Curated annotation (Swiss-Prot):
Modified residues (2,3-didehydrobutyrine): 24
Cross-link Beta-methyllanthionine (Thr-Cys) per UniProt, renumbered positions: 9-14
Protein name: Lantibiotic nukacin
The species this protein was found in: Staphylococcus warneri
Family: Belongs to the type A lantibiotic family.
Post-translational modification: Maturation of lantibiotics involves the enzymatic conversion of Thr, and Ser into dehydrated AA and the formation of thioether bonds with cysteine. This is followed by membrane translocation and cleavage of the modified precursor.
From-to range in the entire protein, with total length: 31 to 57 of 57
Covalent link (Lanthionine (Ser-Cys)) residue numbers: 11-25, 18-26
Subcellular location: Secreted
Gene: nukA
Function: Lanthionine-containing peptide antibiotic (lantibiotic) active on Gram-positive bacteria, such as Lactobacillus sakei, Leuconostoc mesenteroides and Pediococcus pentosaceus. The bactericidal activity of lantibiotics is based on depolarization of energized bacterial cytoplasmic membranes, initiated by the formation of aqueous transmembrane pores.
Amino acid sequence: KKKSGVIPXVXHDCHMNXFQFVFTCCS
């Protein structure tokens, strides 16, 4: 949906760690 997902590691595809929300949108 965005065009800047790789540094923070948001959503669910760039990583599995998580960030901010760290719930639902992460995994």
